[PDB]
């Protein structure tokens, strides 16, 4: 086969099943570029900081998870075509991505009004004038209380993407860099019944209401 990095990009683009196992230690690494090791794993790839065990070095874009709040990947970090992007598992978490803007990973318990207020301090948000449009990918867990995810007071457009059902399930989000400050996003989900294949995580047109 090709490199593990190539195998992940191919699985993403082909819509194949190839799971990702993240070492929890990655959450001690700040958002932005990160040198990791990829390893063979059962039905997928393990991403960690271990140089041994058939490890293949890769430089990725990384977005950690932090309990009770959000983390942000800035678009100025995004440069190298074909570089992979990952965030840590979504365990009831939300991910919001502006096309050409930041990516946010918001922990499950943070209320939508609270995390929107925190996001909105970002320069890209301050530049998003009321009554104007952006392309936005937004992913939340189906069956979670609306309080924790619903942005309909703020955004006009397509419904969010969802993972899971009945407030149960986990998701993986990653991406492939396509140019300066730009990525294509991909996702899969994990049920008590196993993991799905990769699929696109789509940007849709959203107008800022207020």
Numbering used by the authors: 2 to 211
Excerpt from the publication:
The presence of one or more oxygen atoms bound to the sulfur of the cysteine side chain clearly has the potential to alter the local geometry and therefore complicates an understanding of the interactions between the residues of the catalytic Cys-His dyad and the substrate. Analysis of the refined structure indicated that the sulfur had not been subject to the oxidation of its side chain, but the position of the sulfur atom of the cysteine side chain was otherwise unchanged. Furthermore, the multiple conformations of Ser92 that lie close to the active site in the partially oxidized structure were replaced by a single conformation. In this reduced BLF1 WT structure, the Sγ of Cys94 is 3.12 Å from the Nε2 of His106, consistent with a hydrogen bond between them. Analysis of the geometry of the hydrogen bond donor/acceptor atoms of the two residues indicates that the hydrogen bond has a more linear arrangement (D-H--A˚) if the proton resides on the Nε2 of His106 (160°) rather than on the Sγ of Cys94 (144°). Thus, it is reasonable to deduce that His106 is protonated indicating the presence of a thiolate-imidazolium ion pair stabilized by hydrogen bonding and consistent with the “ion pair” proposal for the mechanism of papain. A further significant conformation change at the BLF1 active site between WT BLF1 and the C94S BLF1:eIF4A∆20 complex is an alteration to the torsion angle of the side chain at residue 94. In WT BLF1 the cysteine at this position adopts a gauche+ conformation, whereas the conformation of Ser94 in the mutant is gauche–. We, therefore, presume that in the complex with the WT BLF1 toxin the cysteine adopts the most stable, anti-periplanar conformation of the side chain as seen in the structure of the fully reduced WT apoenzyme alone.
Burkholderia pseudomallei lethal factor 1 (BLF1) exhibits site-specific glutamine deamidase activity against the eukaryotic RNA helicase, eIF4A, thereby blocking mammalian protein synthesis. B. pseudomallei Burkholderia Lethal Factor 1 (BLF1) is a member of the CNF1-like deamidase toxin family which acts by targeting the site-specific deamidation of Gln339 of the eukaryotic initiation factor 4 A (eIF4A). eIF4A is a member of the DEAD-box superfamily and is an essential component in the translation initiation complex, supplying RNA helicase activity responsible for melting the secondary structures present in mRNA prior to translation. A mechanistic similarity between catalysis by the cysteine proteases and the glutamine deamidase activity of BLF1 and CNF1 has previously been suggested given the similar orientation of a Cys-His dyad in their respective active sites. Six of the conserved residues between these two toxins lie in their respective active sites, including a conserved L-S-G-C motif located on a short loop containing the putative cysteine nucleophile (BLF1: Cys94; CNF1: Cys866).
